[model samples]
Target: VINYVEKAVNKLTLQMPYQLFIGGEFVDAEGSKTYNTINPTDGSVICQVSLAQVSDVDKAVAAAKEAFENGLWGKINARDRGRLLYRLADVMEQHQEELATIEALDAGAVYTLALKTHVGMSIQTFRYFAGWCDKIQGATIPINQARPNRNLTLTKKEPVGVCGIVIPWNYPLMMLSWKTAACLAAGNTVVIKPAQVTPLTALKFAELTLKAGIPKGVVNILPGSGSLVGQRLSDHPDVRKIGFTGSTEVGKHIMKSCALSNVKKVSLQLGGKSPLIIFADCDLNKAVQMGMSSVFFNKGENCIAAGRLFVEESIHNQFVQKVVEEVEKMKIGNPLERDTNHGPQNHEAHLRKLVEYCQRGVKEGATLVCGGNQVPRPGFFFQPTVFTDVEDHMYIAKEESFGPIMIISRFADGDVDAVLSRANATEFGLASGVFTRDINKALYVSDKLQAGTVFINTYNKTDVAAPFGGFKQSGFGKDLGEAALNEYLRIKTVTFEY
Candidate 1:
C-alpha cells in the first residue's frame, strides 16, 4: 500500500540540547553527562538529552518534598487546583500540532494517529481529569443522627505527598497525562521518569506545565536509566506514591523497591497477552478488520494488543487466510508518510526480542503464514507477521510478543465453556475481545472472560471517562476516570464530641 519512496521529513523545530525539568526550571545533571535520543522513524540521532543521576533525583525528591510541605500544591483550593489542570490542558491543546509532530517523530507513531489520537486524546484526558480535581473526596459519617451525645465524625481525602511516575514509550504523552494529571489533581507533587528512549514529549509536557504556571517542585521530569533515576524515585522515602506503566517484570521490581523503602502506595498499568475471539456467527469481514487493528495498530506495541486470536473451528482456516491477506495489504515505510500503514518500532532490544519470538514460533510448529522476517531498513522495522495452527503450549501463544505478530488458535464444537477456559489460561488479565451476534452468548462470554476490560462486538474500545486497568497479573488499580484519583489519595477520619 506504500505509494511513495520517501516522505518529506518533518522539520523538527524543537530547541536542541534538552535538559531535565526540576523545580520549575531547566537544569543540567551534576555529572554533565548526556545521552543521545534517537529517532525511530529513520534511526538518526534527534538530540542530546541530559541524563539524570542520583544527585538529580535527590534534587527532584527534595523539591517535591519542599513543595508538598509548603502547601505549594496541597493547600490550594480544590476549584483552583482544577483550574491549574484546565490551564495545562488548554496549553496542550494550543500546541497540539507541535506536540503531535514531536510524538510522531520521536515515538515512531504514524503522523495522523499521533495527531488525532495520541495528542488529541491526551488533551481530552487532562480536561476530563481536571473536572475530577474538586470532585475527589471522602465523606461525612453522620454519627450525630444516631448518637444522643451529638458527635460528629468525618473523613478527609488528602494527597499522599510526592508521587514517582515511570511511563512507557508506547503512548508517551498519553501515559504521562494519565499518571501526572491524576496524581497532581489529587494534590500530590510528582517526579516523572519517562522511558529513557522516548523522553522528548514528557519533557515538552513539563515545559507546558511550566507555561501553565504550575508551581516549581510540583512537577519534576527526570530522564535517565531505570536503574538509577527510576529506582531512586520508586524507592525514595519521601515519595508517597508510585505510578508506573510498562512491563510486568519491571512492575514487580518497582513493588520490591517500594517494599524495601517506605512502602509507598503503588499503582501499575502493565503488559497483557489479551485474546480476541471471533465466532462463526459474526460478520467475518468486520472481525478480520478489527482483528488486524487489534494486533497491528501501533505496530503491536500496545499493552492491550490482542496478541492471541481464537476462531471457531468451522471458520478457522478462512479467518487465518483473510488475516494474511490483510497483513499483505499493510504498508511498511516511514511513519511520516501519510500513506504508510506501519512504522518502525521504538525499542531496539524489543525488536530483537520479537525477531527471536518469530523464529521460535516457526520452530515450535506454528505455521509461518506471512511476513515473519525483519524489514531490511534503516530503522527498527519488522514485517507484519501471522502464525496459524498455534497450540496452547507454545511460548508464542503464551508470552506477549509485543510486535506486529498475530497468533491464530482454534476452538471447536461451538463450546463457549471450552473457549472460555483456554482464553483465560494465561496469566494476563488485562483486555479481551469477543465478536458474536448472539446476545446471550456475547454476554456469557463477556461474563466469563477473565479480564479487566472486555469488548463485545468490537475491540480496543477506550474512553477517557472509563476506568481502565487489569486483573490478576496484568497489574492492579485503575488508570483513567474517577477511580484513578484514589491511587494518589489517602483518607483520614476525625471525630468531634459535643
Candidate 2:
C-alpha cells in the first residue's frame, strides 16, 4: 500500500519554485504582483506564484506568435514535432512519481490515485497526439469542368497560430496535456494559463517542456488569476483560438470576450448536471457501485460527473439504500492518508459551496438520506452526501454543484425513449450514463441521449483515441483524438488550371 502521509510530508518539505515561463525561461512578473497558492488539505500556504497581468499575457502571446511565424518552430517538420512530443512524454514518465506527488499535494487528490491513473492517462494523451503529428492530412476533390479547359482542386490544412489554453484547478496537469499536446501536435504555438488554485503541476510541466528541448517560445506557461491573464489571452488579437475548461459562467464570459474582441475560435468543456439512469432490470450491485464512483470520484469536481441520478420507481428505494450505505462507510479524512477514501474538497470556498447546495436541497423539500454537513476539521472537508425525493426542478438538480453530492429521483414507467428525453432536458450535454443489461436498450438510449459521450455500463471512462466534447450548451470542438488536433488547425483550398 502507498504511504500517502509520508509522501505528502515529503512533498511539503521540499521548497517549490513558482515563476512564470516566457520564451522558454522562468522569470518574475513584469510587476511586483504575486499570489499564494494554498494547500487545501491543510489550509496552509504552499508557495507564492507569480501573478501574471496583461503585460505578461502580451509577452507570452508575443513569444508564441514569434515561435509560430518566425522561429525554428515554424521551420521544423511535422515529424520532428512528433519526436519532441514523444521525448517530452518520456521525460514526464521519468519523473512520474514526483509529478504525481506534487499533483496530490497541490490538488487534494489521493497520491496513489494521481500516480496510477491521472499521470498515466496524461502520458498516454501526449503519446497519442505525438503519433498524429505526421499523419494530419488534407484531401483533394475532383471538380467538374463546365468549360473545355481542365480544372483541378486541392485542399491543405495549416496551423491556427497561437492557441491560448486555460486549464481549471480540478485536474490541472492532465487537462493541460489534454489541450496542450493536441495543440502542439497540430503545429500551433501555445500560451497556457493554469488556474490559480492549482498551478504547481503546470509550472513543473513548463520546466519539463524546456528540459525536453521544445524550442524556445514554442510553449509558454503563465500562472495567474483568470481575471487578468485569462481575459487577456481570450481577447488578444494575435491568439487565433482559445480552449477553456471551467465553469459555465466563466465560459460564457470567455465566449463573449472572444466574439467581441477578435472573434477567436473558442472551445469549452464546461460544467454539467449529468444524469445516471438505473433501470429496474439493471444489476443492483453494479449499478450502486458505478453510481457511487460516478459522483464521489475526484470529490465530484469533474465536469462530467453524474450529479443527478434517475432510477426506475421499482428499484429507487433499494438503490437509494445501497448508495446511502456505501456513502456512510466511506472514510473521509486528510487526502494524504493512505486509507482515506474521500479527501477534502479542493478548497474552503468549494466546501462552503457544497454546504450551501445541501442546505438548498433541504429547503426545497428534498429528503437528505445521509451526510449533508461539513466534517469538523481545519482543512476543507465534507462527507459524501446523498439526497432522495428530489424534484427535477430543484436547484440541486439543476445547477452543477461540483461536489460529492448525489440527488436521486424516481421514474417508474419511463422507457428508453422517456429516459432519453429526460436525460437531455438539462442545458448541458457533456456526459450521461445508463445502467442496463439489455444491449438493445443500451444502443437505443445511447443513440438518443444528447450528450458528447454516453456510457452504458460505465460512468467516467476516457481513452486517448476517443473524441470528447459536447453537443449543445456543453460547448463545441472536441479535445481528444485526431478530431482534437484538427480543432487546432484550419483548412485552406487551392486550385490550378493547366
Candidate 3:
C-alpha cells in the first residue's frame, strides 16, 4: 500500500501569533487556556493556541456588533469598504507563500494544492467580493395603491449586523474568505470561529487585517471548541446571522440554537456524500482523471469529494482498473514537499475513523480492490482506498467516509434515470457529477441530479462566479457568486407618498 517517496523535510519555522483576535487586538483567552495545535504531516506540535471560552465568544460578538452598528467599519462608505477589502486581498497575496506553508503544516494540505487553491482562491475570492461592495443596490417598485403615482414602494438591502462564521478544518482560510468576504462586502462585521485544529492561517490573516488598514472590531478570530464558542455564537442575540461550514450533525444543533434564541438567519454548508456518475460513452481517460480528482482532492478531506461513484456497468472494470493504477502512483509523503500530491488526514482521530470505515466497507460485502488500510508510516497517513461491488443499501455506500476512500458501484449502460435516482437518494445533496459524450444525457442528468452544484463532463470545478450550496441536508444558502451576498443581507421595504 505504501507507494510514496518519503522526504526528510522538517516543519517550516513560522512566527505566528497564538492568541484570540478580538476588537482588532490579539489577546489571551479569559482563563488563559491554551491547547496544542498538531501538525498532521508528522504529528508535530505546530504551536499552542489560546482557546476561547463562552465569555470570550461574548466579547467577540459584542465587538462585531459594535463595529457593525456604530464603529468605523459600518460607517465607512461602500466604495471605501471595497477598497479596504481589496487591500486585505493584496496583503494576503503578498504573503501567499507563508499562508500556503501554514496550510500544509496546520491543515495537512499538500503545498502545491494549498498555494493553488487554498491560499490562491481565498485571495481571489476577497478581491471578487471587494468589487461587489459598491455595486449592491436596491430595487424600485411601482405601487398600485389609491394614488399610484404618488405612492412608491422601494426595497433596500442592508447588512445583517453581526455575523458568526464557523469554518471547517479542511480549508481553513479559504472557507473563511468564502463566508467572510460576502459578510463584509454587505457591510456586516464578522466574529469567526476557526476550527480548533487549524487556527494558524486564520490567526495569521487576523494579523494581516491590521496591516491592511482594517479598523478595530471589524473582524474577530476565536480559536476554541465548537460547544463553547460556536454554540454561544449561534444563540447570541446580537449575532443576526450564522454562517457555518461543517458536519450536518453540528449544523442541525446550530439551527436549533438559532431558532430557540433570536431566530437568527443561519446559512450552513454542511456534510456531503456527493456522487460522481460515469457512463460507458464517456472519454475513458478523462473520466478516470477527473473522477479520481473528484474523490481524492485534499486527500479526500473535502465536503464535495465524490464519496459514491456510479460507473456504467459496461466500462466499470476498465474505469476502476485505471483509477487503482492512478491512486497507486500518488505521492503520500510530506505535505510540504513540492511534489507531494497526497498528504495525511487532518488529525489522528480522523485517521482512525477512516481505517474503521474501510473495515465497515468490507463487512458490508463490498469488495476492497486496493488500499483498505493505513500507510505504515508516522503521522496520520491512510492509503488511497477503493471499493467495488458496492450496493446502495450497504453501510459504506450510505455513510460518508470523508477520506481518501472511493466506494464505487455500477449501473446499466442506458439506466441513466435509475442511476440518477440512486445518486439523489442520499440525504446530502451538496455536489454531483456526470461524465458522458452525449449532450442530451449530460444535460438531462445535470437537470435531474439533486445537488447544489452539478459538473457536466467534469468534476470539482467550483468557480467563484457560480453559486454553491446544497439541496437537502447538505445545508442551505449559497457560498459563492452574487447569491452569497443575500445570506449576509436583509431586505427592508420603504413606502411613502410623494
Candidate 4:
C-alpha cells in the first residue's frame, strides 16, 4: 500500500512541499483544507495538497498587485530581468530528471514524453522569453498632421500590472512556463492558479522562481478548482490580465466574468477539433506514422489533437489498416516504467468520460474499428480507439474527445476545395495538418484552412519561435513567439511638440 506512494517520491530523494505558494512562500490555505492528488497509473494517493479558497485567491492577487505597483518586478532593468530568467532556466535544467519524475508520477505523463516535451519544452520557453527581455521595445511613430521636425511621437511598451494565469492539467509545467515566461519578461507580476488535478509542478516551479532571484510577491501560485479560485481571479479587480488554457466553454465563462468585473485583458488558448487531411498523392508511409502520432500524442489530451482525419477515398482503407496495426502494438502500463508507450488517463473522471464518448460514437452510427472499451486493469487505462464511417454531423466528429481515439472520414479524390471546406467547418480553428508532397497543393491547403497553425507534411510540431493560438472559437491571443509578449504588455503613446 505505502509502496505505491514511496516508489515515485523516493526515486528523486527529495521532500515534496504540499502547500499553497503565495507571496513567494509555501503555506497552507486559509482554512487549511487539502485534497489528495492521485497517481493515475495506480489510482493511489501521492500526497495531500493544500486547496486554495476564495480568500487565498484575494491574498495572492493582492501580493501580485503589490509586486507590480511597488516596482519589485515591474521596474526592473530589462537586461537584469533577462539574466534572472536565464538563471531560472538553468536551475530547471539542472533538475530536469527530478521535474520529469514528478510529472510522470503526478500527471500520468510517459517518462520519455515528460522529459522531452513536458520539461524540455518548458525550459526552452523560459530561455526563449529570456532572450527577448531587452528586445521588447516600442516604436517611434510618424505623425501626418504635424511637421516632422516640429512634432515627435513615440510609443513605450509597459507591463499590464498584475496578471492572473489559470493553467490546465494536460501539460502542467509547460503551460505554466509558456504563460509565466512571457508575463515575467514583460515585467508583470503574476498570481497563477494551477489545475487542481495537477498542481505539484507549478508549486515546485514557484520555489525555483525565488532561487533565481525573482523578487518576493512577483510569482504567487494557488492550487484550486476553477469554480472558486479561477472564477475569483477572473473577477478580481486587482488582476489586470487573465491567461487561460482549457475548454472553450470555460473560456467563454472566464470572458464573461472578466467583462462583469474589471474588463481585464484576456488571452485564451482553448479547445480544438482540428482536422488532418491525408491526400492520395502524399507519402503514404510518412502520413500513416505522423497521422497516428497526431491523435495519440499525449494520450490525445493535447488541445491541438487532430479531432477528425479527412483521408482521400483511395488511400483511406490502407491508411486505417496501418494505424490499427500500430495501435495494437502500443504498450499500456505505468508511465514511469520506460517501456510504457501509452499511459493511463490523467484521472478516473477523464477515463470514464472517454469510455462514455466511445459509446456515444457507436450509438450515432459510427463504426468502432478497434479498441473501444477500457483496459481490464487496476489503473485508469483505456485502449487506443479508432472510429471509421464517422459522419460529419455525428457527435464524435464535431466535439473534441481529447483521448487516444481517432475519428476517420473519407473524402472524394482530387477534391481539394471540397475537403478544405469540410476541414474548416468545425467551430475550432486551433490547428490543421496536411500530408502531401506537392508544394502547391500544400501551400494552397495551408492558406485555405481556417486555423491558427498549419502543418504541411508534418503534424503537431510547434516551436517556441512560432506563434500558437486559435482563430475562431478556439479563442484569442497567443502563447509563444513575439506575439505572446504583447498580451502581457500595454502601449503608451507619448507626444512632444518642440
How high is the CA lDDT of each candidate model?
0.85, 0.84, 0.88, 0.88
Candidate 1 residue spans exceeding 4 A from truth: 1-12, 144-148
Task: Give the C-alpha miss distance for residue 58 in model 1, angstroms.
Answer: 1.0
Error of 2 at 57 (Å): 0.8
lDDT of 3: 0.88
Deviation in angstroms for 252 in model 3?
2.7
Candidate 4's TM-score: 0.97
Model 2: worst 10 consecutive residues (lDDT sum) = 1-10
The candidates, ranked best first by lDDT, are: 3, 4, 1, 2
Reference-based lDDT, residue 420, model 3? 90
lDDT of 2 by residue, 1-498 (tens): 111122236445432448888998888887768888888888988777888878889999999999999998789899999999999999999888778877877888877778766688889999999999999999889898757788788888899999898898888888898999999999999999888888888888887887799999999988887867778887799999989888777656645677677678888888777888888889999999999999998888787889788899989988888888888788887666778888778878888888999999999999998888888877788878888988878888788888889888888665667766777789998999999898888888888888898988888897888998887888888888888978888999998886
In model 4, where do residues sit more than 4 Å from their true spots?
A: 1-10, 145-149
Worst 10 residues of 3 by lDDT: 1-10
Model 2 TM-score on a 0 to 1 scale: 0.95
Tens-digit lDDT string for candidate 1 (1-498): 111112234664554226888888888888777898888877788778889999899999999899889845867898898999999999999888777877877788888888888898899888998898878877888664545667788899988898888889898898888788888888889899999888888888888887898988999989878768877887777887878778877656645677565687877777888988899999999999998999988898888899799999998888887887787778888877889899888868778888899999999899998888779988889989989999999999899988889899989957889888889998989999999988998998999999999998887778888889999888889988888888888899998887
Model 2 CA deviation exceeding 4 Å by range: 1-8, 11-15, 146-148
- Report the number of clashing residue pairs per model: 0, 0, 0, 0
